[PDB]
DNA sequence: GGGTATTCGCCGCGTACCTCTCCTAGCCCGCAAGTATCCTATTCCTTGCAGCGGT
């Protein structure tokens, strides 16, 4: 069902797309994985240490 | 006495850092505050003794 939902949108079903480096501007081979992840900022700051 | 087994009691169990809270109990005696009470006046009445005109 993840594959089906992905294909509902026009995204590549494999889950991995092809990026481009920022500095050089040339392509990464080996298509990489990109998505959306939920992240939290834990209560261990640097300025309290 | 003596070689042995069984029990008793002491010794020991990682490093560094960050955050928070809490730290004696009970009696006693001076003492401030607040209060109910006691003495202090005024107005009426009916006595008891000293002056006092009068003769």
Automatic annotation (TrEMBL):
The modification N6-acetyllysine is found at residue 7. DNA-dependent RNA polymerase catalyzes the transcription of DNA into RNA using the four ribonucleoside triphosphates as substrates. The RNAP catalytic core consists of 2 alpha, 1 beta, 1 beta' and 1 omega subunit. When a sigma factor is associated with the core the holoenzyme is formed, which can initiate transcription. Belongs to the RNA polymerase beta chain family. This is DNA-directed RNA polymerase subunit beta. It comes from Escherichia coli.
């Amino acid at each position: 069902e993840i594959k089906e939902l992905l294909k509902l949108g026009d995204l590549p079903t494999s889950g991995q797309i092809r990026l481009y480096d920022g500095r050089t501007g040339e392509q990464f081979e080996r298509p990489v994985t990109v998505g959306y992840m939920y992240m939290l900022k834990l209560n261990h700051l640097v300025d309290d240490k």
